[PDB]
Amino acid sequence: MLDAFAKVVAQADARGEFLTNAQFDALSNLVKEGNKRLDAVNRITSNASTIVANAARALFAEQPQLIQPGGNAYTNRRMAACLRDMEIILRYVTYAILAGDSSVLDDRCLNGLRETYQALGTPGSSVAVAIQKMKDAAIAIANDPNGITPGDCSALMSEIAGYFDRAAAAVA
Amino acid sequence: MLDAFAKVVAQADARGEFLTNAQFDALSNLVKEGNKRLDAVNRITSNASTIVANAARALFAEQPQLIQPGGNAYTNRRMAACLRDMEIILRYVTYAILAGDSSVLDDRCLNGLRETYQALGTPGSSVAVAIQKMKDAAIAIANDPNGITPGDCSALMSEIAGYFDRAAAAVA
Amino acid sequence: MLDAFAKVVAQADARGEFLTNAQFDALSNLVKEGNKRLDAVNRITSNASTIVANAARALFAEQPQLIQPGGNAYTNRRMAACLRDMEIILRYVTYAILAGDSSVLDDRCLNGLRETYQALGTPGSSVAVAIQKMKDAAIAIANDPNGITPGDCSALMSEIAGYFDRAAAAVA
Amino acid sequence: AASRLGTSAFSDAPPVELRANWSEEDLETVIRAVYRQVLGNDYVMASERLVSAESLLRNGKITVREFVRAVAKSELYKEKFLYGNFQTRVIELNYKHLLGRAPYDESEVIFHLDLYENEGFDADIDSYIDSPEYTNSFGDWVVPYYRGFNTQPGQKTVGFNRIFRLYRGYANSDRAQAEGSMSRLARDLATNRANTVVPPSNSDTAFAYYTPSADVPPRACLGGSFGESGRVYRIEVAGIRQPGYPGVRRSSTAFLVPYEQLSAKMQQLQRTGARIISVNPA
Amino acid sequence: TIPLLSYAPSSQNQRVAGYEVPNEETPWRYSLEDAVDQSDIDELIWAAYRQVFSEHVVLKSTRQPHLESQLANRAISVRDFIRGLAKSETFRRLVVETNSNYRLVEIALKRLLGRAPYNKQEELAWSIRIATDGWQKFVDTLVDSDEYTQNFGDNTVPYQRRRYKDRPFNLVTPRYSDYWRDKLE
Amino acid sequence: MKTPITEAIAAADTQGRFLSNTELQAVDGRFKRAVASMEAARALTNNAQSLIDGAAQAVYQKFPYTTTMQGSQYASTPEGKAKCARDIGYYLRMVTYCLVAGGTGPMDEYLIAGLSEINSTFDLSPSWYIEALKYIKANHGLTGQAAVEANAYIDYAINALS
Amino acid sequence: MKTPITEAIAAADTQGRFLSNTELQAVDGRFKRAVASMEAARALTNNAQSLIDGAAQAVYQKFPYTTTMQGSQYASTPEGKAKCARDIGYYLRMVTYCLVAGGTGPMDEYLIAGLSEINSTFDLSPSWYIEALKYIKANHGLTGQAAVEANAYIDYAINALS
Amino acid sequence: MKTPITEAIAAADTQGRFLSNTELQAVDGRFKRAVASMEAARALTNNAQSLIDGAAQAVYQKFPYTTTMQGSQYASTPEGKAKCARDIGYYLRMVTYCLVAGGTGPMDEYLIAGLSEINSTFDLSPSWYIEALKYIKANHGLTGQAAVEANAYIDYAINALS
Ligand SMILES: CCC1=C(C)/C(=C/C2=NC(=C\c3[nH]c(/C=C4\NC(=O)[C@H](C)[C@H]4CC)c(C)c3CCC(=O)O)/C(CCC(=O)O)=C2C)NC1=O
Ligand SMILES: CCC1=C(C)/C(=C/C2=NC(=C\c3[nH]c(/C=C4\NC(=O)[C@H](C)[C@H]4CC)c(C)c3CCC(=O)O)/C(CCC(=O)O)=C2C)NC1=O
Ligand SMILES: CCC1=C(C)/C(=C/C2=NC(=C\c3[nH]c(/C=C4\NC(=O)[C@H](C)[C@H]4CC)c(C)c3CCC(=O)O)/C(CCC(=O)O)=C2C)NC1=O
Ligand SMILES: CCC1=C(C)/C(=C/C2=NC(=C\c3[nH]c(/C=C4\NC(=O)[C@H](C)[C@H]4CC)c(C)c3CCC(=O)O)/C(CCC(=O)O)=C2C)NC1=O
Ligand SMILES: CCC1=C(C)/C(=C/C2=NC(=C\c3[nH]c(/C=C4\NC(=O)[C@H](C)[C@H]4CC)c(C)c3CCC(=O)O)/C(CCC(=O)O)=C2C)NC1=O
Ligand SMILES: CCC1=C(C)/C(=C/C2=NC(=C\c3[nH]c(/C=C4\NC(=O)[C@H](C)[C@H]4CC)c(C)c3CCC(=O)O)/C(CCC(=O)O)=C2C)NC1=O
Ligand SMILES: CCC1=C(C)/C(=C/C2=NC(=C\c3[nH]c(/C=C4\NC(=O)[C@H](C)[C@H]4CC)c(C)c3CCC(=O)O)/C(CCC(=O)O)=C2C)NC1=O
Ligand SMILES: CCC1=C(C)/C(=C/C2=NC(=C\c3[nH]c(/C=C4\NC(=O)[C@H](C)[C@H]4CC)c(C)c3CCC(=O)O)/C(CCC(=O)O)=C2C)NC1=O
Ligand SMILES: CCC1=C(C)/C(=C/C2=NC(=C\c3[nH]c(/C=C4\NC(=O)[C@H](C)[C@H]4CC)c(C)c3CCC(=O)O)/C(CCC(=O)O)=C2C)NC1=O
Ligand SMILES: CCC1=C(C)/C(=C/C2=NC(=C\c3[nH]c(/C=C4\NC(=O)[C@H](C)[C@H]4CC)c(C)c3CCC(=O)O)/C(CCC(=O)O)=C2C)NC1=O
Ligand SMILES: CCC1=C(C)/C(=C/C2=NC(=C\c3[nH]c(/C=C4\NC(=O)[C@H](C)[C@H]4CC)c(C)c3CCC(=O)O)/C(CCC(=O)O)=C2C)NC1=O
Ligand SMILES: CCC1=C(C)/C(=C/C2=NC(=C\c3[nH]c(/C=C4\NC(=O)[C@H](C)[C@H]4CC)c(C)c3CCC(=O)O)/C(CCC(=O)O)=C2C)NC1=O
Ligand SMILES: CCC1=C(C)/C(=C/C2=NC(=C\c3[nH]c(/C=C4\NC(=O)[C@H](C)[C@H]4CC)c(C)c3CCC(=O)O)/C(CCC(=O)O)=C2C)NC1=O
């Protein structure tokens, strides 16, 4: 698991030398916008359950063949597993947001997920659609302008979108 | 393809230094006893067919299971293959004797031999017995003191024995 | 593609009779004059590029129609091709010198060469002039004796001139 | 080299032994970790968890060793792996889940299989649980972890290769894998054959490279090959799909190519879309 | 050194497209891709020998023992086996030494690549390939042409592309033309 | 043909290059050995008449059945004896040609090529030629390095027949 | 490497044939020339430092602009002068390697292997090294057969650079 | 040659399909950009003589040391001056063809192809022409799109020579 600071340190360790002024400025930019990062992760974590539940209802309304008899989201055991996996993707994306780097997202959660779903038979494209539903929901929840001291946050919202996108593309 | 001269050059190139006086002296010794080397190669190649044939007869007399039905040198196609491989080993050993080093022998007929024979089912121990039979026959014909000018040839005889042994050790 | 020894042996094989004493002495004479042949090929090959280039410089000016627009040597590509073919002829002639016969010159070259150029649209007469200019260049460079023990190598020069003439007559 | 190989972070050991063996929170973690390792990261539903074992687990009547054995012999474990797979494959899974390694040689299968044939499965699990390896690497108070990655114990080199066949990623579970329902390390184990390491998928295209040596070139060149200057590099590929004349055939395969031609061959392979698994000198 | 002088292609059966099911005159396709048993591999090896060298000249001394062992252990592709036949010394003695470059282009194209020369201009076009690059490099590019990779993939023995109502190349082309017969009586 | 000179030339032609010093060294060695080679060839050809007849009688002695039991493959008839003389003469003539050429080229092109194919069709046992060539190798009447060259070519033929 | 010995071995290997008398003759010629070759190599390495220093000064005199004109290709700095010495040392070391190998193999494998490509990408001029090799060819201080072979290899390098 | 129209035709022919809208769009782009290129070609042909004269003097001034050394590869003699004028004119004459063809086809067909062997054998340094063509490149008298497209072709040729 690498976070942003750790990522810069690891590159600098590969090249030896000593931390350049540019790298220092980059990390200073990260810390001066840190309060924003923490607020976003707090908002997403606080509504995790409703995000997953709403996205799940939408997925099963849009693609009914999944929950029809004989489909992969049938029999109430596989339904539990599907809800579990949606929540797990959300959890590791939340980890990534707090870290500031997508290394955690690709090192544990997306590490092997593709072949897992390929072997199970679960349609990867549908999982990607579900992740995108969660993407819109979570980004809206975090970008809600009421409830906190106002200020520019669009960069962080785009970063959140980037994490969700990485997961959705890797599953599909 | 590296002969003795090429081997010396390659080591010196790795170091990046001109050949030392010692290396020059070694190669001068090689060339001053070169007639012995090429005479041995000539004698081995002149009796190649008889060498392989006699050694084959001896191998099948010592280990009758090979030529009994079911054994790996049965059905006359595998017998042809066995004779072919014996003469192939003799040919690459002859190359090695002319070159002065075992590089060709270890690169082009010994590299993957063990794995291929293991997969085929060919008994490697029996192949080693066969190549040692060839070793004694070829050593004797090359070392025959009658028919050519007298001299000392013991170093060259030890070298040819070493190469036959190398093949025997790799195949088994 | 034959050599001197092979040429006499081939005629003897057509006749079906053991090599006659006369043929033996002829080949002995050929071996007697081996060193000069080797010297000549060594000297010509060391200066090959310069020989052909120097002759080419003069050729293009003495035959301006070729380098004027609309001529066969015009454009960079066809000029490159003319240089290439001059060097090709020189290479096969050097082959012939070492062989001692013009067999190689007539086998893989000079067998339909005129027809190839005639179909291509190259003027054959100009090619003949080029070959003759090359012939003068080659006879000169081989026949500038200095730096070695002298001899009457005029025979070698005459046979080299014969090879060049054979090519020139075959292309025109 | 961590992320590509798959070992994201397996860099500590979770014991439960404490004055507060429950520790009020740590025991929850230990129970989860045992479920992840013993059941092969299977998603156990809440209703079918082994509540009876956890009762004794917090009480201290049973140690972590006893908890691991209880899960291993409970029908929860049997339904996933034991009943449904070839017996040798089950031996492989036991080695992966209980001792955190892969079979190092055929004698392992011989011994465990004979136990199963005569004594019964319960005795087989018993042998894994109380083998010197389990008693040492783990300690009746330490959840089993994949120690096969680390080489400290003393093991055949092939072990490293072989463990990467069983572990196909952090997300993966052995109930759900590319080659599942059939032996994954059986043909190789009899021949003591090494295996190329197949990296698990990570945000890029994956093509699980099966390596049956039934129809592949040998690991070595076994000749002079083309005879050009330089040795012969063996190039593997999996996803060949573009040039299907009868259907391409043997989509996953290797080619022994002389050095000078490698570049050309490479581009050809890339054109078909197969991602080269390995390029090993032969 | 020079981009090979462009040749004008002529209409031919091989160039044409045709939606035909295989005839009884179909060339027959010897594919080592299936990795057939050793006995069938013998047939495949024999067909390649029959193509690169003619049926007439494939004797014991011509047979390369190494090649026989090559195509038996799922080694270098049938294409590389063909190239090995082509660059072997016996082939150079039998074909290369007995013909001029212009005829060599035709012979090699008919046998190795399996299509007749497009026109006389193409015979000229690849003659220089033989000269500058060397015969070994000429056959290298001949079997490394994009056309070849489409025609016979890798593990398919070369065959006459489609001799539809056409004389087979082997039975219309001798080992060497009458031009070299001047050295014979 | 596989003549040392032509082999060097072909090696240079494969790489499309003017004759390098390596090839020139090789042909120089050929010329240096040619004195002994040509003297050996002269010796063998001027003694050829005795050699051919002696080899014929040698094979008749080693294989008496070849002189008695009837068949076209055998020399039971005077016509067959003529055939035997003709073929052993072919072998001797080829060896002299190879001696003068400096390589195995001549015998490979005029004899060894397809030798196995025809010696089975006409049912000429190779062992007969083997014994004849052994007689010639024992009675060639050469000495020294001349002898070594000639015997090398003879044994090349012997191994090819086998 | 294209050593004469290995060349003969490869020629026999592509045909799967035992070493014939022709190959043995070629290798014998190699060994005959090797006495002079080794003498020449010993001479060149005994004077190695003197030869490289002299060649360095020769190119400094022939091309004075290279010692003043600014540019990475020029030796207007001590490191650049070191690079000049290093490269002429490479050429001399390759010559000694080729002398002991008895062929141009080493020269082709460790040099003359895209020498045009490299000098063009860096834009360094071949003429520099050509003149340096000329000085070495004149100052080698050899006589006899050794002299002719060493100068032949140096000239091989010279014409290969062009 | 490598004309945009011709390249689209070749790409469609190797697939064996009728011209799809992709190829038609490409040729449309060629026609749309053939207004400025043809204007530039007209401009450079109408002032061709003056610009070649200027370029000739430019190369004479940049390389007076070649302008004074006597030889076949130099313009020191009046005959060589005439040759230099004609070859500078050749470069301009090809650039106009390149402008009209809208591609690099003429460049490769009338030059570039085998530039290395020519610049090695005659050793006519490309730098001579390069300096002349840079004079042309600034003094061409085009503007805007015509200028930038012409400059693109010119610098393609310059970087191709090196
Ligand atoms: C428990 C550890 C901990 C956390 C989590 C934390 C968060 C935190 N982030 C802050 C700043 C901020 N909060 C925002 C919030 C936003 N403005 C917007 O227009 C968006 C709608 C939204 C992005 C989600 C911004 C832009 C700042 C930066 C300005 C500042 O630092 O006061 C502030 C001060 C003012 C505020 O409450 O917003 C706190 C306390 N502080 C902590 O000690
Ligand atoms: C056709 C190629 C070719 C051959 C074959 C050849 C042979 C050859 N071997 C020689 C020497 C020799 N050969 C031997 C050989 C031996 N001593 C022993 O004890 C062993 C029984 C035997 C090893 C097989 C010795 C000791 C010499 C003399 C010393 C030497 O030069 O190596 C000599 C020099 C002295 C002489 O005339 O005998 C020649 C010419 N020369 C050639 O150009
Ligand atoms: C077997 C030995 C051998 C020969 C002889 C040979 C010649 C040869 N030269 C050719 C071209 C050519 N040859 C020349 C040569 C000349 N240009 C001139 O101005 C002069 C009149 C003449 C030199 C004196 C030229 C200009 C071309 C190119 C023709 C063109 O593309 O229009 C071609 C046309 C096909 C091609 O370019 O590949 C052949 C076959 N190739 C060979 O392999
Ligand atoms: C249409 C495309 C085309 C080009 C580009 C071309 C180049 C070209 N330039 C040449 C020569 C030449 N180029 C020069 C040029 C110069 N001398 C100098 O001092 C100057 C610095 C320089 C002017 C920049 C000279 C003097 C020759 C004649 C050399 C000779 O014939 O030996 C030649 C040799 C034959 C001849 O003189 O024409 C060719 C083929 N040929 C072509 O068909
Ligand atoms: C590696 C290939 C190779 C070369 C290059 C070679 C050259 C060579 N040339 C020689 C001599 C000689 N070369 C000549 C030749 C000539 N007479 C003339 O008028 C002409 C100018 C010239 C013909 C080009 C003569 C007369 C001798 C001295 C006597 C002799 O050796 O026959 C000699 C013997 C004495 C010496 O070393 O000088 C050698 C070794 N030998 C070789 O094995
Ligand atoms: C053989 C089967 C079996 C039994 C019988 C068993 C008993 C058992 N009950 C326990 C807990 C407990 N059991 C109770 C039970 C009660 N609290 C009350 O107020 C009531 C009077 C009474 C129920 C009628 C409580 C409160 C605990 C929790 C103790 C704690 O964590 O603080 C514990 C402590 C560890 C744990 O919770 O896992 C054990 C071992 N465990 C077993 O595996
Ligand atoms: C699904 C349950 C299951 C099966 C079926 C199984 C098969 C199996 N049989 C084995 C041995 C064996 N099996 C046989 C079988 C036979 N030999 C013969 O001659 C007969 C034709 C045939 C019996 C009729 C032999 C000879 C061995 C020993 C092989 C050896 O040690 O090399 C082995 C090797 C390891 C060992 O011996 O422990 C396995 C894995 N393993 C399993 O877990
Ligand atoms: C912590 C990172 C991590 C992930 C992501 C992971 C995935 C994962 N999901 C699984 C199952 C599953 N995954 C799904 C998923 C879905 N089915 C659908 O219809 C939807 C489209 C989709 C949800 C969006 C289902 C239905 C199963 C159960 C299949 C089964 O056990 O039979 C399984 C194995 C079977 C089991 O549950 O025992 C794994 C290993 N494992 C991990 O360790
Ligand atoms: C003669 C023996 C032979 C076999 C067996 C064979 C199989 C084979 N089927 C293929 C394709 C394929 N095969 C399928 C088959 C299926 N798709 C599905 O959705 C189903 C689950 C399943 C059928 C029920 C598909 C979809 C492809 C295309 C894969 C792709 O383009 O990605 C490919 C990939 C290359 C190609 O399409 O040519 C091979 C090699 N080829 C052969 O030559
Ligand atoms: C690099 C040069 C080279 C070597 C060395 C080589 C070995 C070799 N020997 C083989 C076959 C064989 N080798 C044997 C050998 C033997 N059987 C016995 O009883 C004996 C003890 C022994 C002879 C000494 C047999 C019986 C086969 C046939 C196996 C088969 O194809 O069924 C095979 C299998 C394919 C083939 O026949 O080509 C290889 C690859 N192949 C090569 O290309
Ligand atoms: C399948 C149909 C087919 C036929 C008919 C055919 C004929 C044919 N016979 C040939 C050779 C030959 N054909 C003969 C035939 C004879 N010599 C004689 O003395 C007799 C009068 C006659 C036998 C009755 C000979 C001697 C050669 C070899 C010529 C040579 O290489 O010099 C060749 C030369 C090319 C080669 O060797 O492959 C061909 C093409 N080829 C074919 O593919
Ligand atoms: C120049 C290359 C060349 C060779 C080698 C050659 C050999 C040759 N020997 C033959 C036959 C023969 N050769 C012999 C010779 C012998 N009879 C004996 O008793 C002895 C053991 C033996 C002498 C050593 C006989 C008897 C036949 C006739 C076979 C028959 O009619 O069945 C035949 C069949 C035609 C015929 O009957 O003449 C050929 C072609 N022809 C050639 O062109
Ligand atoms: C063993 C095979 C081999 C060769 C041939 C070789 C040559 C060689 N010389 C180089 C550079 C160089 N060489 C010089 C040398 C010189 N300075 C001068 O004034 C002289 C005119 C000249 C000596 C003749 C300089 C200055 C550079 C650096 C040029 C640059 O950095 O651009 C470079 C570029 C990489 C580097 O900086 O070293 C190579 C590759 N290196 C090799 O490994």
From Swiss-Prot, chains A, B, C:
Q: Quote the cellular component terms of the Gene Ontology held in the record.
A: phycobilisome; plasma membrane-derived thylakoid membrane
Q: Which GO terms describe its biological process?
A: photosynthesis
Read off the SUPFAM superfamilies from this record: Globin-like (SSF46458)
| Chain positions found as N4-methylasparagine | 72
What subcellular locations does the record give? Cellular thylakoid membrane
**Short name of one Pfam family:** Phycobilisome
Identify the residues that bind (2R,3E)-phycocyanobilin 2.
Answer: 153
Gene3D superfamilies assigned to the protein according to its UniProt record, in alphabetical order: Phycocyanins (1.10.490.20)
User: Where along this sequence does the record place binding of (2R,3E)-phycocyanobilin 1?
Assistant: 82
Provide this UniProt record's keywords sorted from A to Z.
Answer: Antenna complex, Bile pigment, Chromophore, Electron transport, Membrane, Methylation, Photosynthesis, Phycobilisome, Thylakoid, Transport
Presence of the UniProt keyword Thylakoid in the record = yes
Q: Does the keyword Zinc apply?
A: no
Bilayer disposition of the protein: Peripheral membrane protein
Q: Describe its PTM?
A: Contains two covalently linked bilin chromophores.
Q: Which CDD domains match?
A: PC_PEC_beta (cd14768)
Q: Which domain of life is it from?
A: Bacteria
Q: What does this protein do?
A: Light-harvesting photosynthetic bile pigment-protein from the phycobiliprotein complex (phycobilisome, PBS). Phycocyanin is the major phycobiliprotein in the PBS rod.
Query: What family does the Swiss-Prot or TrEMBL record give for this protein?
Result: Belongs to the phycobiliprotein family.
Which NCBIfam families does the record match to this protein?
Answer: phycocy_beta
**UniProt subunit comment:** Heterodimer of an alpha and a beta subunit, which further assembles into trimers. The trimers assemble into hexamers.
Protein name, UniProt field? C-phycocyanin beta subunit
* Organism lineage: Bacteria, Bacillati, Cyanobacteriota, Cyanophyceae, Acaryochloridales
From Swiss-Prot, chain D:
Might you name a Gene Ontology BP term for this protein?
photosynthesis
**Keyword DNA repair set for record:** no
Tell me where it mainly resides: membrane
How does the protein associate with the membrane? Peripheral membrane protein
Q: Which UniProt keywords apply?
A: Antenna complex, Membrane, Photosynthesis, Phycobilisome, Thylakoid
Q: Which PROSITE patterns match?
A: CPCD_LIKE (PS51441), PBS_LINKER (PS51445)
Q: Where is the PBS-linker domain?
A: 1-175
The family database entries (Pfam families) matched by this protein are listed as: CpcD (PF01383), PBS_linker_poly (PF00427)
The CpcD-like domain, residue ranges: 230-282
Location(s), subcellular: Cellular thylakoid membrane
**Top-level taxon in the UniProt lineage:** Bacteria
Q: Name one GO cellular component term.
A: plasma membrane-derived thylakoid membrane
Family affiliation? Belongs to the phycobilisome linker protein family.
As for what it does, the entry says: Rod linker protein, associated with phycocyanin. Linker polypeptides determine the state of aggregation and the location of the disk-shaped phycobiliprotein units within the phycobilisome and modulate their spectroscopic properties in order to mediate a directed and optimal energy transfer.
| Name listed for the protein in its UniProt record | Phycobilisome 32.1 kDa linker polypeptide, phycocyanin-associated, rod
From which organism does this entry originate?
Answer: Thermosynechococcus vestitus (strain NIES-2133 / IAM M-273 / BP-1)
Per the UniProt record, the lineage of the source organism begins with:
Bacteria, Bacillati, Cyanobacteriota, Cyanophyceae, Acaryochloridales
Swiss-Prot record, chain E:
Q: Where in the cell is it found?
A: Cellular thylakoid membrane
- Tell me the name of the encoding gene: cpcG2
**Organism of this sequence:** Thermosynechococcus vestitus (strain NIES-2133 / IAM M-273 / BP-1)
Entry keywords, A to Z: Antenna complex, Membrane, Photosynthesis, Phycobilisome, Thylakoid
Q: What is this entry's stated membrane topology?
A: Peripheral membrane protein
Lineage, broadest ranks:
Bacteria, Bacillati, Cyanobacteriota, Cyanophyceae, Acaryochloridales
Q: Which residues form the signal peptide?
A: none
What subunit structure does UniProt give? The phycobilisome is a hemidiscoidal structure that is composed of two distinct substructures: a core complex and a number of rods radiating from the core.
Every PBS-linker domain range: 10-185
Query: One of this protein's GO BP terms?
Result: photosynthesis
Superkingdom to which the source organism belongs? Bacteria
This one is known as: Phycobilisome rod-core linker polypeptide CpcG2
Main location per UniProt?
A: membrane
Q: Which family does it belong to?
A: Belongs to the phycobilisome linker protein family.
Q: Which GO terms describe its cellular component?
A: phycobilisome; plasma membrane-derived thylakoid membrane
Q: From which residue to which, out of the full length, is covered?
A: 2 to 186 of 246
Protein role: Rod-core linker protein required for attachment of phycocyanin to allophycocyanin in cores of phycobilisomes. Linker polypeptides determine the state of aggregation and the location of the disk-shaped phycobiliprotein units within the phycobilisome and modulate their spectroscopic properties in order to mediate a directed and optimal energy transfer.
UniProtKB/Swiss-Prot annotation, chains F, G, H:
List the GO cellular component terms.
Answer: phycobilisome; plasma membrane-derived thylakoid membrane
Which family, according to UniProt? Belongs to the phycobiliprotein family.
Q: Does the keyword Transmembrane apply?
A: no
Q: Which gene encodes it?
A: cpcA
Task: Kindly give the InterPro entries that the UniProt entry links to this protein.
Answer: Globin-like_sf, Phycobilisome_asu/bsu, Phycobilisome_asu/bsu_sf, Phycocyanin_a
Q: Origin, by domain of life? A: Bacteria
Say yes or no: keyword Transmembrane helix present. no
Where is this protein localized, as stated in its record? Cellular thylakoid membrane
Q: This chain belongs to which protein, by name?
A: C-phycocyanin alpha subunit
Q: How does it sit in the membrane?
A: Peripheral membrane protein
Binding annotation for (2R,3E)-phycocyanobilin: 84
Keywords noted in UniProt? Antenna complex, Bile pigment, Chromophore, Electron transport, Membrane, Photosynthesis, Phycobilisome, Thylakoid, Transport
- Fetch the NCBIfam families from UniProt: phycocy_alpha
Any one Pfam family here would be Phycobilisome
One BP term from GO: photosynthesis
> How does it get modified after it is made?
Contains one covalently linked phycocyanobilin chromophore.
The record, for PANTHER family, names: C-PHYCOCYANIN ALPHA SUBUNIT, PHYCOBILISOME 32.1 KDA LINKER POLYPEPTIDE, PHYCOCYANIN-ASSOCIATED, ROD 2-RELATED
- What role does it play? Light-harvesting photosynthetic bile pigment-protein from the phycobiliprotein complex (phycobilisome, PBS). Phycocyanin is the major phycobiliprotein in the PBS rod.
Q: How does it assemble?
A: Heterodimer of an alpha and a beta subunit, which further assembles into trimers. The trimers assemble into hexamers.
